[PDB]
Design a protein around this nucleic acid. Structure first.
Ligand code: MG
Ligand code: MG
Ligand code: MG
Ligand code: MG
Ligand code: MG
Ligand code: MG
Ligand code: MG
Ligand code: MG
Ligand code: MG
Ligand code: MG
Ligand code: MG
Ligand code: MG
Ligand code: MG
Ligand code: MG
Ligand code: MG
Ligand code: MG
Ligand code: MG
Ligand code: MG
Ligand code: MG
Ligand code: MG
Ligand code: MG
Ligand code: MG
Ligand code: MG
Ligand code: MG
Ligand code: MG
Ligand code: MG
Ligand code: MG
Lengths: 73, 101, 119, 88
RNA sequence: AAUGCGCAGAUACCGGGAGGAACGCCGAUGGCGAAGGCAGCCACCUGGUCCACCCGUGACGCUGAGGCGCGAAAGCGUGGGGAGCAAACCGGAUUAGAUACCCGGGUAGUCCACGCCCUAAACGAUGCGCGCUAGGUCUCUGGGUCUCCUGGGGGCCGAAGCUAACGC
């Protein structure tokens, strides 16, 4: 219950401080630009804190979205 | 002196002449502001997640430096003073906190 | 008599009414409709039945500009939201894709009292 | 800030014997280094009250090491202050 | 429902501009702070704190009348600003009545600077400091030989014990 595919798993040797690694960063947002919760990233209390700061920076550079558009309804 | 990472997003539209014109001013402004320049990668242009100044693209730049702290905000100002300079993001460097590696 | 074939449907959902605008691929309205346009008055415009007619009306009106294909863009929280889609689908008009585009602030403007209670 | 090296010259200038890093003087000297930065800071940023609390505590911790030092060896006492510039 | 706005073309939709305020997700079961209280990102300038080493000093400690400083919100002064919201107020409804709850407007204010004010369910309704007295467990953050040990912090259940009880 309340568990599918975890994101820390699908990847490997990444730098959580790299705010340019779009191809890696973007795995951590939902279909909308929204930053995924811990229960889906699979990051630890800390890793998540560092990634959120990283993603935020990468949004200002215009590499990651801030918000996107749901595509079913 | 501290080690910063200067991010500069350029107007993707400029032909060769106009481009390396901006670069010259970029590097000049560094020399004037006491920015000893370590490594540097011009990562070309990339497709932006949202448009910046009506362009869906942006030309990218990245300078790892070492420069006097007291002169960073005034250096970041001077870099932004131009038109074809869309974003400037001066971050201070960090040890790369690896994860799940 | 513009002739367009391909176009967009913006469903504007609300707890109070439903308004359906049809536009060209640039976004400029060909035609529109709503609960009030189908002669309803007060609370019944929010009613999803209304929303069904409101979409069907707006459809036919546009199906006479030779529309066939629509991208749907739902944009509201309200009742008669999905039913406005249901109507859009069952009007022969090919629905090429539905997108929710309800606008939401990154916490910005102080909302009306009615809409906050505990913030 | 106060860099490691900045801080060194203070400990050398004030240590009783070599490698002494915690004699009364070395501490009073160090705090004065600290107080003087901070008091120069709040001269500019006077709305920064949270820092200002640090300051009363430095002064506090300090004007107490001195109270003890003056109780133990006024020789060293009249010395430390003349050396610094406290009591003003 | 009605005030209200709309043929001086609104609502809905696309493009451009101005501005003011707040910072979605991450985000809480979390963190920081003496308290008030603190949440977009970057930089600068600063405060507190925690661990290891067991290096320095040698009781330099605790509390603290008065004093001094800080102190949500509302409120006050001068200047600025003013998107949204909104006491008073102006209307529409509701009612037996309606100085209300609901609806449409709306000034002060909410914002910024500087100077006041000094209050609170300013709450853990629990002064600060130090020592002692089973354990389990969840969590944040250090360290070491890292299945486990050892610190600091935040919860829960519980030994003895305490309590008018509740509970601790
Ligand atoms: Mg009229
Ligand atoms: Mg007319
Ligand atoms: Mg409008
Ligand atoms: Mg517009
Ligand atoms: Mg204006
Ligand atoms: Mg606390
Ligand atoms: Mg509180
Ligand atoms: Mg510090
Ligand atoms: Mg020793
Ligand atoms: Mg000795
Ligand atoms: Mg005290
Ligand atoms: Mg106050
Ligand atoms: Mg106030
Ligand atoms: Mg005022
Ligand atoms: Mg005023
Ligand atoms: Mg005015
Ligand atoms: Mg009102
Ligand atoms: Mg209003
Ligand atoms: Mg003030
Ligand atoms: Mg008082
Ligand atoms: Mg005790
Ligand atoms: Mg570990
Ligand atoms: Mg504990
Ligand atoms: Mg706490
Ligand atoms: Mg018992
Ligand atoms: Mg008792
Ligand atoms: Mg009992």
């Amino acid at each position: 219950p309340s568990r599918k595919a975890k994101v820390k798993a699908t990847l490997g040797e990444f730098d959580l401080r790299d705010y340019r690694n779009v191809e890696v960063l973007k795995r951590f947002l939902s279909e909308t630009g929204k930053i995924l919760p811990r229960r889906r990233t699979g990051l630890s209390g800390k890793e998540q804190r560092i990634l959120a700061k990283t993603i935020k920076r990468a949004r200002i550079l215009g590499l990651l979205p801030f918000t996107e558009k749901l595509v079913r309804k | 002196m501290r080690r910063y990472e200067v991010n500069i997003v350029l107007n993707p539209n400029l032909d060769q002449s106009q481009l390396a014109l901006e670069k010259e001013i970029i590097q000049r402004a560094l020399e004037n502001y006491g920015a000893r320049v370590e490594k540097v990668e011009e990562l070309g242009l990339r497709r932006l997640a949202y448009p910046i100044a009506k362009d869906p693209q942006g030309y990218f730049l990245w300078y790892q430096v070492e420069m006097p702290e007291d002169r960073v905000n005034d250096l970041a100002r001077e870099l932004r003073i131009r038109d074809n300079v869309r974003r400037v993001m001066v971050v201070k460097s960090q040890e790369p906190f690896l994860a799940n590696a | 008599k513009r002739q367009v074939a391909s176009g967009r449907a913006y469903i504007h959902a609300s707890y109070n009414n439903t308004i359906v605008t049809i536009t060209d691929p640039d976004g400029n309205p060909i035609t529109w409709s709503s609960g009030g346009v189908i002669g309803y008055k007060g609370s019944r415009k929010g009613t999803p039945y209304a929303a069904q007619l409101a979409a069907l009306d707006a459809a036919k009106k546009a199906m006479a500009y030779g529309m066939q294909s629509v991208d749907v863009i739902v944009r509201g929280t309200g009742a008669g939201r999905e039913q406005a889609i249901r109507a859009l689908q069952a009007s022969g008009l090919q629905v090429k894709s539905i997108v929710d585009d309800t606008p939401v602030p990154h916490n910005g403007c102080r909302p009306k009292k009615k809409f906050r209670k505990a913030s | 800030p106060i860099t490691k090296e900045e801080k060194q010259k203070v400990i050398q200038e004030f240590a009783r014997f070599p490698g002494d890093t915690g004699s009364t003087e070395v501490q009073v000297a160090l705090l004065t280094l600290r107080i003087n930065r901070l008091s120069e800071h709040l001269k500019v940023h006077k709305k920064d009250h949270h820092s200002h609390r640090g300051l009363l505590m430095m002064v506090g911790q300090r004007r107490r090491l001195l109270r003890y030092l003056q109780r133990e060896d006024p020789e060293r006492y009249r010395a430390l202050i003349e050396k610094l510039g406290i009591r003003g």
